[PDB]
Amino acid sequence: QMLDESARLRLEARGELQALRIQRYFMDAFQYGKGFSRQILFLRDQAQKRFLDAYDLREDLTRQVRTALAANPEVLGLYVVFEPNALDGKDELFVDQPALGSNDKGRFSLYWAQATPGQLESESMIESELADTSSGPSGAAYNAWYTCPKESGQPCVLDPYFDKVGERQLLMTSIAFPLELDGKVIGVMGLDINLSNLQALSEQGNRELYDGVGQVGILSPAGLFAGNSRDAGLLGKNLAKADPQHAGELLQLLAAGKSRLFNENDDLKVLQPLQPIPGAKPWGVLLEVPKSALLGP
Ligand SMILES: NCCc1c[nH]cn1
């Protein structure tokens, strides 16, 4: 039977298409963040060249972070952190100025968030929070949304982790940017993305995939579910919870950016890795569809 080969090719292509969809979602947010970081660095340069004073600058940044978050209802939070005195050399003047995005040490450390689109509240991140290395569900340090682009000089897409919005703990990922001046990192900017958005993405793609007869899952590099059309209760959970026998193999395939098909009863599984942004560690889509659907009516 040459039936099995056509079923494999179809699912491989479906796996590729689903990865394109997830990649586009991440890349749209990456575009938006990259464009806004230029606005941040320009304002910083206007103040460095004394065309703009520090009080107006910190006010301007604080307002424009909020406006840029309000403009993208796909984004959960927007944070901006500068190294000490690296925004304007004037941190000492803004100690405990949260209405100007300045924290307990005057460092410009600003967050705007919208738990639902439009309920914009703000926080100035204190030093102990910027330095909190507590391990999360993936093993990664809590403050990787700050230290990751600062250490590499490159953007990062964190594994799912819990963070505070309002006074609730939400499960999320972030696209975090280094703010570089002449090849040196002077600060960090980042977009927070509610994992419920990726859960919706995996459900919507499953509906378009043979009328939802199978399932679509989204895997972060560390192997946490960022989306699972069959059970949202798997958000933030390790792949071994749903796929113990192949968890280990699936994760090394993922990290090596290798695709693979799996035969199981009369169902097919495909793991399709994907880079969410350029150079990022591969995420993946896991697709399972019964063979009878692939060789459909
Ligand atoms: N969500 C990562 C940025 C942040 C703001 N407040 C706490 N953490």
Q: Which stretch of DSSP H or E encloses residue 189?
A: strand 184-194
* Atom of ligand 1 lying closest to residue 77 CA: 1
CB 264 within 8 A of CB 215: no
- Whole-angstrom distance, CA of residue 149 vs CA of residue 176: 6
Ligand 1 centroid from CA 36, angstroms: 18
Ligand 1 centroid from CA 163, angstroms: 6
Q: What is the resolution of this structure in A?
A: 2.5
The top-level CATH class assigned to 28-193 is alpha beta
In the Cβ-directed half-sphere of 129, how many Cα atoms lie within 13 Å? Answer: 16
Q: Which residue, chain included where needed, has tokens 């909190």?
A: 132
Q: Check whether 123 is labelled as a binding-site residue.
A: yes
Instruction: Name every protein residue with a CB atom under 6 angstroms from any ligand 1 atom.
Output: 77, 79, 111, 123, 125, 145, 163-164, 174, 192
Ligand 1 centroid from CA 17, angstroms: 32
Q: Check whether 53 is labelled as a binding-site residue.
A: no
CB 193 within 8 A of CB 170: no
Q: Which stretch of DSSP H or E encloses residue 253?
A: helix 247-255
Q: Whose CA is closest to atom 8 on ligand 1?
A: 163
Count the Cβ atoms, other than its own, within 10 Å of residue 20: 13
- Whole-angstrom distance, CA of residue 15 vs CA of residue 99: 46
Q: Check whether 4 is labelled as a binding-site residue.
A: no
Probe target for ligand 1 pocket from 103, 107, 123, 134, with the most ligand atoms within 8 Å of CB: 123
- Whole-angstrom distance, CA of residue 27 vs CA of residue 39: 19
Q: Whose CA is closest to atom 3 on ligand 1?
A: 79
In terms of Cβ atoms closer than 10 Å to its own Cβ (0-12, 13-18, 19+), residue 285 is buried
- Whole-angstrom distance, CA of residue 188 vs CA of residue 28: 19
- Whole-angstrom distance, CA of residue 203 vs CA of residue 235: 13
Q: Which of 261, 249, 251, 260 is nearest to 282 (CA)?
A: 251
What pairs with residue 82 in β-bridges?
187
Q: Which of 9, 10, 17 is nearest to 272 (CA)?
A: 17
Ligand 1 centroid from CA 217, angstroms: 26
Ligand 1 centroid from CA 62, angstroms: 15
Instruction: Report helix, strand or coil for 77.
Output: strand
Q: Check whether 161 is labelled as a binding-site residue.
A: yes
- Whole-angstrom distance, CA of residue 79 vs CA of residue 145: 9
- How far, CA to CA in Å, does 40 sit from each of 61, 86, 122, 141? 7, 13, 18, 26
